[PDB]
Structure formats: C-alpha cells, structure tokens
Enzyme design. Structure first.
Site, short mmCIF file in Angstrom:
data_model
loop_
_atom_site.label_atom_id
_atom_site.label_comp_id
_atom_site.label_asym_id
_atom_site.label_seq_id
_atom_site.Cartn_x
_atom_site.Cartn_y
_atom_site.Cartn_z
N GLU A 238 32.76 -0.89 13.93
CA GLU A 238 32.01 -1.73 12.99
C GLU A 238 30.64 -1.14 12.58
O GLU A 238 30.06 -1.53 11.55
CB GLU A 238 31.76 -3.09 13.64
CG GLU A 238 33.04 -3.86 13.95
CD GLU A 238 33.75 -4.37 12.73
OE1 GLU A 238 33.23 -4.22 11.61
OE2 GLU A 238 34.83 -4.98 12.88
N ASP B 256 30.86 -5.10 3.30
CA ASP B 256 31.79 -4.25 4.05
C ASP B 256 32.79 -3.55 3.11
O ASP B 256 32.67 -3.62 1.89
CB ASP B 256 32.49 -5.04 5.14
CG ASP B 256 33.54 -5.99 4.61
OD1 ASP B 256 33.80 -6.00 3.38
OD2 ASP B 256 34.10 -6.73 5.43
#
Ligand SMILES: N#Cc1ccccc1O
Ligand SMILES: N#Cc1ccccc1O
EC number: 3.2.1.17
Length: 175
Positions: free
Chosen positions: A22, A31
């Site tokens: 992540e 993202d």
C-alpha cells in the site's frame, strides 16, 4: 540461504506486507482506481468529492487534518484497519475455515486480501476458497489473477497472489 536470509521471515509480518503493497502517504491521494486514500492503504471514501474525503479523514483521525496526517496517526489507523480485516475473516462462516486451514504466511496473504477487497468481495470467490482449502496453490493463484481486483491494479495485488501460490515471503524481498 545465508544466516541473514533465514532471518528475513522473522522480519516479515502482515504489517510489513501491507506497508509494502500500500505504501505510506501522509497526504490524501487518489489510488490506482482513483479513490481517495491516505496513510497505509486507508480508503477514505469512493466519492469523487475531495471534501467528502477530508470529512472522512477528520472523523477517522479525530482532529482537523485538512488532508494531512502524521506517521504515528497513519500507523494507528493502519493497525485499526488490519484488526478490522482480521475480525472480518474470523467472524465469517465461509472465510474462517479456509483461513484456519492456511499456514502462517498464507494467513497474512488472506488478511491482506480482505484488507484490500473487503469481506464480501473475498467470500464471493467461491472457487479460489475451495482451491486454497484443498492446497491447490497454482490453481488458486491463476484464478486470483482473473479477478478485477488484480487486473485493475496489478502492482498492489501481484505480491499477494505470489504469496498465495508459494507460502513464502519471496515476493517482498529485494524491493
Ligand atoms: N478464532 C480464532 C482464531 C484466532 C487466531 C488464528 C486463527 C483463528 O481461527
Ligand atoms: N482468497 C482468499 C481468502 C480465503 C480466506 C480468508 C481470506 C482470504 O483472502
């Protein structure tokens, strides 16, 4: 494997795993799918409205952040999200038996998978779950690689798939 190499698995755990997949970002960003995210993979909202994401942030952290957090805050939120994924697996009648059948490293891949997709998305993977329970690791990995989760954002998912296939930490070495 060298002495140092044999120590590597003791350095790896679910927190280190997700931290590599992540990343760590102290400001709100979009993202790979364009969703507002912060910290270590913390999805704030699926809304396109930045002010909705900032609202969620202040609620999650408990202060006026204006889109920015500290390392310590990111870590606290990450620990919360990891515990939520673990609790989500253990209370689920479909995922718990599969998880219990897995070795320690694959259990980390399972927690990571749930952290990323949520419980209903994972528990919907009927074939993969049977494959994992039956130790059909190559087949499980080929089938995970058909998923939208992997295909829309391969770099975030690829190491988790490899870890399901092998049960080792090798995909996390040599960053
Ligand atoms: N319940 C439960 C539990 C706790 C740690 C690891 C596996 C489990 O099924
Ligand atoms: N795939 C899969 C899976 C199975 C059990 C618990 C968590 C998971 O991501």
């Amino acid at each position: 494997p060298t002495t140092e190499n044999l120590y590597f698995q003791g350095s790896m755990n679910i927190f280190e795993m997700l931290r590599i997949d992540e990343g760590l970002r102290l400001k709100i960003y979009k993202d790979c799918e364009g969703y507002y995210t912060i910290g270590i993979g913390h999805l704030l909202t699926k809304s396109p409205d930045l002010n909705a994401a900032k609202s969620e942030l202040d609620k999650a952290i408990g202060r006026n952040c204006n889109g920015v957090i500290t390392k310590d805050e990111a870590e606290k939120l990450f620990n919360q999200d990891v515990d939520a994924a673990v609790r989500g697996i253990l209370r689920n009648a479909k995922l718990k038996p599969v998880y219990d059948s897995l070795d320690a490293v694959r259990r980390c891949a399972a927690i990571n998978h749930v952290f990323q997709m949520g419980v209903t998305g994972v528990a919907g993977f009927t074939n993969v779950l049977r494959m994992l329970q039956q130790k059909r690791w190559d087949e499980a990995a080929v089938n995970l690689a058909k998923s939208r989760w992997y295909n829309q954002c391969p770099d975030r998912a690829k190491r988790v798939i490899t870890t399901f296939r092998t049960g080792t930490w090798d995909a996390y070495k040599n960053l």
